[PDB]
């Protein structure tokens, strides 16, 4: 676990995934309660999420010592955390569009597009829209969360040894425990003045979990997730998807 470090995760963040072999994790089903006038916009948002999931699979693959895990464990870890990582990245990206007595109005789903709060109200997802921007985006800006802590939390989210069905739980424990050491050391060497920062950062993770669970309710309600096929998509993506390219 010596290669696993915040510095390596920082240089991995710059790597760009090659043209994503499309895996339809999210899609507008044949019979869907999404009104017909909005199926095309919703479908485009699913295609956007699918690309980000594909970039997430390629990111997790090259994480130090991740590919040395059992292949079934690698699938379960990505299967259980891809949603939270999407929301966490959304919340990280949305900080720029914070105030660019009213709540935040814009959510950055991807670099080249934002979601307006009125579009979330029309979709009936206003509450979860506000939770992402306040409990995550606004809190991370107030917390002055830097990129080093962001990539560390992403690794901590992914390397969850409590995922049901793992065959080598301790091999995942060793990886997450190394991340706890890395995050605590970074807070002591660079953020030495701030007390309780290590705890303050990890307190976003349960908030991220609840929001992720609420999103899964909406996604399943509108029959947007292909849950019966996600593990299969993760299997093929880890094996066949092209490695990222360093822009340098």
């Amino acid at each position: 676990v010596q290669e696993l470090s915040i510095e390596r995760l920082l240089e991995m963040e710059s790597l760009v995934a090659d043209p994503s072999e499309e895996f339809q994790f999210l899609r507008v089903g044949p019979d869907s309660n999404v009104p017909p006038k909005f199926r095309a916009p919703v479908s485009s948002l699913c295609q956007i999420g699918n690309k980000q999931i594909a970039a997430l699979v390629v990111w997790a693959r090259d994480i130090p010592h991740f590919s040395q895990l059992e292949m079934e464990d690698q699938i379960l870890l990505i299967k259980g955390s891809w949603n939270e990582l999407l929301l966490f990245a959304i919340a990280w990206r949305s900080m720029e569009f914070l105030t660019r007595t009213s709540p935040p109005q814009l959510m950055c789903l991807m670099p080249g597009m934002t979601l307006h709060r009125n579009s979330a109200l029309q979709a009936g997802v206003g509450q979860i829209f506000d939770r992402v921007l306040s409990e995550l985006s606004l809190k991370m800006r107030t917390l002055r969360v830097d990129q080093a802590e962001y990539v560390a939390l992403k690794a901590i989210i992914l390397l969850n040894p409590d995922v049901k069905g793992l065959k080598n739980r301790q091999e995942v424990e060793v990886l997450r425990e190394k991340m706890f050491l890395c995050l605590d050391e970074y807070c002591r060497r660079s953020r030495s003045s701030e007390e309780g920062r290590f705890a303050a950062l990890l307190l976003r993770l349960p908030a991220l979990r609840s929001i992720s669970l609420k999103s899964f309710e909406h996604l399943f309600f509108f029959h947007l997730v292909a849950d019966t096929s996600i593990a299969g998509y993760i299997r093929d993506a880890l094996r066949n998807h092209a490695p990222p390219i360093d822009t340098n």
Binding site: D162, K164, E177, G196, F198, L203, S210, L213
Partner: protein, 231 residues
């Protein structure tokens, strides 16, 4: 060398451990005092244990500082999560089961008879995961306080509840540090305990999804649970 525990921190730890043993016992001999019967044993045992959580929370330093509606918000949201901790604390590795002294309601069979058998394995998995952490009564008690003062939606003064939680968080951090001689592994022990906060969010949601399932099947909860679990 290693920052010692202040007198306020040692007193807080001793206070929480003392009342944890007092509210541990789902007693007052109310087991005697207090397929429909299997579901009624679960709901009756839960009411008694939830009332122990509320009295434990109302006696926590800082609970009187927040608004009344903020107290109701915290108690309504932490009740099911703390219930998972209390049941998990009674896990027995040798039998791979939950031993609650009055081992009837929270056994596998009563849950099978009441139609909630699909939930047992998700519960026992958490029991195994928490048991492997080897938390002492200080770790477990401070965690319970940290669950209660977590940031919940709808808080009128979320910053105030955060300041209260930080006092228990800092107490837990210093306790682990002193117990490990400022070893780097203090962050691992600390981080894993905070990781439980994430996992009991799922269990509390699954509990909320069963309350929804009961309403659709028209099986109703005792009104105390209906009000606290926001039917």
């Amino acid at each position: 060398n290693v920052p010692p525990l202040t007198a306020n921190q040692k007193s807080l730890i001793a206070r929480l451990v003392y009342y944890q043993e007092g509210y541990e016992q789902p007693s007052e001999e109310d087991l005697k005092r207090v397929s429909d019967m299997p579901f009624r044993q679960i709901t009756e045992m839960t009411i008694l244990t939830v009332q122990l959580i509320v009295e434990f929370a109302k006696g926590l330093p800082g609970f009187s500082k927040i608004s009344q509606s903020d107290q109701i918000t915290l108690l309504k949201a932490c009740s099911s999560e703390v219930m998972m901790l209390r049941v998990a604390r009674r896990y027995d590795a040798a039998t791979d089961s939950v031993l609650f002294a009055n081992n009837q309601a929270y056994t596998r069979d009563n849950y099978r008879k009441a139609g909630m058998a699909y939930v047992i394995e998700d519960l026992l998995h958490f029991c195994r995961c928490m048991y492997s952490m080897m938390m002492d009564n200080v770790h477990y008690a401070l965690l319970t306080a940290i669950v209660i003062f977590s940031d919940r939606p709808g808080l009128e003064q979320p910053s105030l509840v955060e300041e209260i939680q930080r006092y228990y968080l800092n107490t837990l951090r210093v306790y682990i540090l002193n117990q490990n001689s400022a070893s780097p592994r203090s962050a691992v022990i600390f981080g894993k305990i905070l990781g439980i906060l994430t996992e009991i969010r799922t269990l509390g949601m699954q509990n909320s999804n069963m309350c929804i399932s009961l309403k659709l099947k028209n099986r109703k909860l005792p009104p105390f649970l209906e009000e606290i679990w926001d039917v």
